[PDB]
Amino acid sequence: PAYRILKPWWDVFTDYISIVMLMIAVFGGTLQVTQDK
Amino acid sequence: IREESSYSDIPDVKNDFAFMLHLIDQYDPLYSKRFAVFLSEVSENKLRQLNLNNEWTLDKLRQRLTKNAQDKLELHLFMLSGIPDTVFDLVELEVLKLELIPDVTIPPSIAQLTGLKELWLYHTAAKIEAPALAFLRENLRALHIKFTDIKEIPLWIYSLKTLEELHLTGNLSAENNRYIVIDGLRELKRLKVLRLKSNLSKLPQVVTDVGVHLQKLSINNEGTKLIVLNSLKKMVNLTELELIRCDLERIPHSIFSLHNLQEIDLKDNNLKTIEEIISFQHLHRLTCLKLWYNHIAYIPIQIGNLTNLERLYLNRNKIEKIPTQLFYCRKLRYLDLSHNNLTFLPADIGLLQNLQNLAVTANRIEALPPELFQCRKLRALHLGNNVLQSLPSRVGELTNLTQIELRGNRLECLPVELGECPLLKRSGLVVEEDLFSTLPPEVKERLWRADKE
Amino acid sequence: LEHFVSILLKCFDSPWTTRALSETGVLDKKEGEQAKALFEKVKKFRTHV
Amino acid sequence: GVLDKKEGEQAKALFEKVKKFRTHVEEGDIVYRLYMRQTIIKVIKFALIICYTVYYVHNIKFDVDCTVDIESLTGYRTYRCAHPLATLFKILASFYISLVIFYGLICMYTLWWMLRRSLKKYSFES
Amino acid sequence: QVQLVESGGGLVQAGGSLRLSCAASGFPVYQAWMWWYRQAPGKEREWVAAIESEGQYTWYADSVKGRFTISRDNAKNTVYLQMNSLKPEDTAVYYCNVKDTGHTTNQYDYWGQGTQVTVS
């Protein structure tokens, strides 16, 4: 794109960490809703 | 970057713009380095220079060349940001004028120019390199510089050995000094013309020592007091002594020793009496004595003692009569007496058979002597604002009279015999339109038919 | 940010920067006009920011 | 014989920027370092994965026996239990072990290629 | 490059003899029309001595005429100035001044470092 020059290495690292945490969140939510007996 | 690339003129940016640069550096320093050039004054200056070169093409400067009063090719640059490099491609250029050009650098490509002989640096600080400086040291004749401070004049001016003319139009009066800055004029032993204009109070010792080989010295103090104290005796070969607006208030006693002078002018020097002509008999080459714009009550009778007068001027003075002895000098050619409180012209002026130009404007001369018109070598006769009612009828015998003006006079009759002259055109005789219609028209068509060419 | 990145991208690939970095001849009129306009707008953006 | 002025100017600018980029890049030595380090990480990760996965793949089976010490709630101490996915997970683990074996062989080839040529120096002789 | 250094300047009682010297640079001493300048405390800098190239003619101000002798010495690239029986008004700071450079490259004018001389 164009703003990739405006994101230092820590910004993209935090973006990927947030993506992984979102995957954890959705996996846990699907687990709980599907079965949390 | 500003310490490595010599682009040291990059000021630090303030908040909210330095942060973005830091972010770019964290991403890639190359983007910041490439964007850094637009923040440097040097890049802007060289882009201006390139745009000047692209705009000021060779043909534009070629067409922009003019002819000066000295009849040589001249180019005038006014308020320009610099000298285009296409200017130095006009080998036929001879005079260059620069005015209000800031931080002007003369490149070595000026050596490409060959006909250049005069340089005009008006309020411009010129920086010149070694090869161009050698080229100017070898091929430069005249120099013109205008300034207000001492420092803004070039410091390499004394390095120009082949200079012939100098023109200072600044304020050299520094803080309690004997004009130290111009003291370098002793370096230039080839100088011919010096044109100091700095409101001199005392003549600098450097000028006194350098005038022993000087030819045309013109000084203009704009009414500032000037004192000699035997300062013109050192010179022995000077010929021009222009002392315009130097507040002499009296004819100095140091001029008598300069017998080799030929042109002398004392305009606006607040003179009172000029009875020192008896001391000018030593000057056997004095032929262009100018004394206009002064305050002289009467002309001394000692003019007749001299006989070499060829250009005499006492314009804008208050003299009640012209003594006849002044007409003894028969070799006058450019005697002019304009704006003078004269009553009538003696008939002795008719013995001036060698006179060419005579200006009698703003003179209360009631009548013109018939003896004056007996001469046939008259070339110019200017009459403005004079008490005249009629024109003498013997002017028709004149054939070499190139021009004559009768403006401001309350004349009413134009004699017919004026219309027969081999040298007579519309531009030569300019008079009032109403007074022009009193002459018969049959010669008007003939004259206007030859007015084309 | 959009204005700054647009200006930075324009100034990154401009051949005027290429010449300036090469020197650390003949330039087209359009290129010179564009470079002057870019200089002016960069200065204006700097004053704005 | 004759090439266009625009083409020549473009080639000249390309030459200049190539030279400048070459000067700028030779002092980095970062792309090669990161590539080597990530390949080393891949190789060691493959080694550990293969070791532990091969060691623990035999630990999954259909029939299991659990003595979970639950008497006050059910009344039986031991239970014979069946894991329906045990065979499917076992064949999946075998497939994953084979895939990791191939991946590790590829990474070993990459390491041997990067350690037998001194890739900091380019020949450019041909 | 081109540079000049003053030497020999020092405090001295009235009536003494002083020989100021200058150390020059790549520009020829035979060429490079040369000046010996003074700046007086409580006063403005004023020229004293002048030695010319191609003829070696001497110039002086009227106040410094008679008891100051300037010369240029080649094969060592030096400029010398001798003052005998200096008066109290001689207390100043003396510089060597180059207004014209050598034959070629005609480098800009440079002012000397200067030495302070005092008359008691």
Side-chain angles (χ1 to χ4, degrees):
Chain A
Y3 301 92
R4 67 188 188 278
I5 72 178
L6 207 50
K7 293 176 174 294
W9 65 267
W10 47 76
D11 280 1
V12 290
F13 281 13
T14 48
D15 197 357
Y16 277 159
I17 292 301
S18 300
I19 284 297
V20 182
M21 291 186 299
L22 179 60
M23 291 198 308
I24 286 184
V26 299
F27 184 61
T30 48
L31 277 168
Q32 175 190 354
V33 66
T34 317
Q35 69 283 341
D36 201 43
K37 60 194 64 174
Chain B
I1 173 178
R2 90 180 177 181
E3 77 95 5
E4 185 272 343
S5 185
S6 301
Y7 277 87
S8 179
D9 55 321
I10 301 182
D12 297 4
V13 293
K14 274 305 183 65
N15 43 15
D16 199 78
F17 202 81
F19 176 82
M20 303 176 181
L21 293 184
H22 289 302
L23 252 56
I24 292 301
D25 294 5
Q26 291 300 328
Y27 177 81
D28 185 17
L30 298 185
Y31 290 81
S32 177
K33 184 176 182 180
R34 291 188 172 85
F35 177 76
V37 300
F38 285 83
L39 273 60
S40 61
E41 293 76 295
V42 157
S43 299
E44 172 64 35
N45 291 11
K46 54 188 48 183
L47 187 66
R48 287 205 208 91
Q49 196 70 22
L50 209 162
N51 280 331
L52 223 59
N53 301 291
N54 205 331
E55 195 280 336
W56 292 105
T57 64
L58 181 57
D59 63 80
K60 296 183 59 60
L61 279 317
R62 182 181 312 276
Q63 186 268 356
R64 208 188 185 279
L65 250 59
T66 65
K67 301 295 298 182
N68 64 339
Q70 298 189 1
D71 190 11
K72 53 191 60 180
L73 289 181
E74 176 271 336
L75 184 56
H76 184 58
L77 273 67
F78 188 68
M79 293 181 173
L80 260 297
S81 179
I83 303 183
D85 301 328
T86 59
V87 178
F88 303 103
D89 296 357
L90 291 173
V91 298
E92 60 275 8
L93 183 58
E94 297 141 358
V95 175
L96 177 64
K97 292 196 181 179
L98 310 176
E99 184 174 3
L100 270 304
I101 294 187
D103 196 6
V104 46
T105 297
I106 309 175
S109 63
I110 192 183
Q112 178 184 4
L113 298 183
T114 56
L116 181 61
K117 300 298 186 177
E118 307 193 1
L119 182 61
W120 301 58
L121 299 168
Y122 280 179
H123 281 10
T124 62
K127 302 175 179 299
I128 190 169
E129 286 71 18
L133 194 44
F135 160 77
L136 286 200
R137 175 192 295 260
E138 295 303 320
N139 190 18
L140 190 48
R141 295 296 99 91
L143 173 63
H144 300 65
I145 53 179
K146 183 187 60 181
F147 51 96
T148 57
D149 268 332
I150 302 300
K151 49 176 294 184
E152 49 179 338
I153 84 174
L155 290 82
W156 47 265
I157 173 183
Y158 311 133
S159 177
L160 270 41
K161 298 301 169 298
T162 187
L163 189 67
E164 300 188 3
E165 301 183 345
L166 181 57
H167 301 255
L168 304 199
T169 58
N171 189 305
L172 281 314
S173 181
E175 316 87 0
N176 298 332
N177 65 324
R178 315 306 293 262
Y179 297 90
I180 169 187
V181 45
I182 63 177
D183 226 324
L185 260 306
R186 318 177 195 273
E187 274 274 17
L188 320 182
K189 302 290 297 300
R190 283 287 308 184
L191 187 64
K192 296 178 177 296
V193 180
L194 186 62
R195 287 236 58 258
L196 296 176
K197 183 179 75 179
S198 65
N199 310 335
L200 283 310
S201 180
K202 181 64 179 179
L203 183 59
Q205 187 255 3
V206 48
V207 188
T208 67
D209 213 333
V210 84
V212 302
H213 64 265
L214 196 60
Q215 179 176 344
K216 177 190 303 296
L217 177 54
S218 179
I219 299 183
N220 194 321
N221 292 330
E222 297 294 336
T224 313
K225 191 72 187 67
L226 181 59
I227 50 183
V228 277
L229 299 183
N230 285 336
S231 66
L232 299 176
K233 295 179 62 60
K234 303 306 175 184
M235 316 176 186
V236 289
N237 50 17
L238 192 71
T239 56
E240 286 76 11
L241 195 65
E242 292 79 5
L243 299 180
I244 302 119
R245 302 179 181 96
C246 294
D247 193 7
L248 296 182
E249 196 249 6
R250 270 303 290 269
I251 297 186
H253 295 62
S254 61
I255 189 184
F256 309 150
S257 302
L258 280 172
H259 60 75
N260 200 265
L261 286 177
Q262 303 178 0
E263 298 80 1
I264 299 178
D265 191 0
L266 297 182
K267 139 174 43 182
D268 288 319
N269 268 324
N270 311 321
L271 300 186
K272 290 293 114 179
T273 171
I274 55 174
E275 294 184 348
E276 310 174 23
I277 312 301
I278 184 60
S279 50
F280 291 150
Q281 312 302 319
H282 304 70
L283 282 71
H284 299 274
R285 269 74 67 174
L286 176 54
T287 71
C288 189
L289 177 58
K290 309 174 167 179
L291 297 177
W292 69 71
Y293 284 9
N294 286 269
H295 323 131
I296 276 75
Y298 62 90
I299 298 185
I301 72 174
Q302 284 70 18
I303 302 299
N305 306 139
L306 282 174
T307 177
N308 46 19
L309 284 316
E310 182 264 317
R311 294 179 178 88
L312 187 58
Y313 296 113
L314 287 86
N315 302 321
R316 279 69 171 182
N317 279 254
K318 293 81 195 173
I319 307 170
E320 57 191 24
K321 264 303 298 179
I322 303 298
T324 64
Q325 51 81 33
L326 181 138
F327 306 111
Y328 288 169
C329 326
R330 308 275 178 257
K331 64 179 60 59
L332 266 311
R333 295 199 282 107
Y334 288 146
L335 166 62
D336 289 335
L337 303 176
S338 68
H339 182 202
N340 200 343
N341 313 22
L342 298 178
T343 57
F344 53 89
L345 303 178
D348 196 11
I349 200 179
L351 292 188
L352 281 62
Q353 288 84 198
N354 199 23
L355 203 153
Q356 310 177 333
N357 177 22
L358 172 54
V360 208
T361 72
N363 283 108
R364 305 276 76 100
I365 308 296
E366 276 64 39
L368 304 182
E371 184 67 20
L372 178 57
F373 288 140
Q374 190 170 350
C375 311
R376 309 302 160 88
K377 208 179 185 62
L378 270 302
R379 182 171 279 95
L381 288 314
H382 193 3
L383 302 181
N385 187 20
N386 301 335
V387 177
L388 295 175
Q389 72 170 13
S390 179
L391 183 128
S393 56
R394 68 193 316 267
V395 193
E397 286 80 346
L398 270 299
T399 53
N400 201 18
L401 189 146
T402 62
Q403 52 187 350
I404 180 180
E405 293 80 16
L406 305 177
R407 312 311 301 266
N409 302 267
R410 55 170 187 262
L411 306 178
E412 38 74 29
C413 55
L414 268 62
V416 291
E417 85 279 340
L418 303 187
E420 289 72 22
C421 180
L423 206 166
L424 208 172
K425 305 191 67 60
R426 190 45 57 205
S427 60
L429 271 63
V430 276
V431 292
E432 308 167 19
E433 292 290 328
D434 201 325
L435 306 187
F436 176 66
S437 63
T438 194
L439 62 101
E442 70 272 351
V443 298
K444 304 196 311 181
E445 303 98 15
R446 299 178 59 181
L447 190 141
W448 283 325
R449 185 148 47 257
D451 283 354
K452 288 82 182 180
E453 57 185 7
Chain C
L1 292 185
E2 179 179 357
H3 194 182
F4 172 80
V5 300
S6 60
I7 290 184
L8 228 301
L9 263 298
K10 290 193 303 179
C11 298
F12 180 80
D13 64 332
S14 63
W16 170 255
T17 56
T18 300
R19 187 182 186 275
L21 270 62
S22 65
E23 282 202 354
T24 303
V26 44
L27 186 68
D28 183 58
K29 284 244 58 183
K30 266 61 183 182
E31 208 290 326
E33 171 195 15
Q34 165 267 0
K36 181 180 182 179
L38 192 49
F39 261 94
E40 178 57 37
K41 67 171 53 185
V42 161
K43 187 59 61 59
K44 192 174 60 63
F45 184 72
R46 179 176 183 177
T47 56
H48 171 267
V49 165
Chain D
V2 44
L3 271 56
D4 187 61
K5 283 263 97 286
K6 263 57 184 177
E7 189 276 342
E9 186 178 15
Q10 168 265 0
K12 192 176 188 178
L14 201 48
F15 267 98
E16 187 72 18
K17 64 175 52 183
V18 160
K19 186 64 62 59
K20 172 163 47 59
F21 165 80
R22 181 185 182 185
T23 55
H24 140 264
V25 130
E26 302 322 304
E27 41 92 356
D29 194 67
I30 181 61
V31 172
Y32 175 85
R33 282 199 308 165
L34 291 199
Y35 200 96
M36 175 65 63
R37 290 175 182 179
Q38 73 183 35
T39 297
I40 290 294
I41 289 182
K42 293 183 182 178
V43 167
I44 62 179
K45 179 147 302 301
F46 142 78
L48 301 183
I49 283 173
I50 274 303
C51 290
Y52 97 94
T53 310
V54 170
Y55 183 56
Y56 281 143
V57 61
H58 287 353
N59 210 132
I60 72 182
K61 50 188 181 307
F62 183 79
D63 296 85
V64 301
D65 315 325
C66 52
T67 307
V68 293
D69 184 66
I70 297 183
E71 277 268 25
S72 57
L73 298 176
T74 71
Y76 305 90
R77 289 183 179 181
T78 177
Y79 302 83
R80 184 79 173 182
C81 207
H83 194 195
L85 287 196
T87 167
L88 181 49
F89 269 3
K90 187 179 303 177
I91 66 180
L92 227 57
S94 298
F95 199 17
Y96 178 74
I97 281 186
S98 62
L99 290 184
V100 170
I101 280 295
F102 290 162
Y103 192 95
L105 292 188
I106 292 178
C107 287
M108 289 295 188
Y109 184 90
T110 293
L111 253 194
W112 168 90
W113 175 81
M114 270 205 304
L115 294 176
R116 269 284 176 259
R117 280 81 173 174
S118 181
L119 279 69
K120 299 179 178 303
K121 181 74 168 181
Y122 196 65
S123 192
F124 244 163
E125 67 90 12
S126 177
Chain E
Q1 213 240 357
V2 161
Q3 60 86 27
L4 293 84
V5 172
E6 287 70 16
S7 58
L11 186 144
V12 62
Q13 201 69 26
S17 61
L18 185 61
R19 188 58 176 266
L20 298 177
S21 172
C22 211
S25 301
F27 64 97
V29 114
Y30 193 86
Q31 227 283 345
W33 199 98
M34 192 63 55
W35 253 346
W36 264 105
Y37 248 89
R38 82 176 167 184
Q39 202 297 317
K43 209 163 298 178
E44 184 62 29
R45 183 153 58 177
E46 203 268 325
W47 151 73
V48 174
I51 181 62
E52 101 169 19
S53 174
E54 315 296 335
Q56 290 76 32
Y57 298 156
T58 64
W59 306 108
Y60 281 93
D62 298 333
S63 59
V64 301
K65 264 286 295 181
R67 56 180 183 89
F68 292 80
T69 61
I70 186 187
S71 181
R72 53 175 53 185
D73 307 328
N74 203 271
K76 49 182 173 178
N77 198 18
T78 50
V79 188
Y80 280 27
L81 176 57
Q82 171 76 9
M83 47 283 296
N84 298 90
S85 302
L86 23 72
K87 293 308 174 183
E89 48 87 12
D90 193 68
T91 296
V93 196
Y94 280 78
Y95 291 26
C96 329
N97 187 14
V98 40
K99 291 276 105 177
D100 174 63
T101 342
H103 290 96
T104 182
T105 66
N106 310 130
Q107 199 174 184
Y108 279 63
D109 297 356
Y110 295 146
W111 270 108
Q113 316 310 312
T115 53
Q116 301 204 1
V117 303
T118 311
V119 183
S120 179

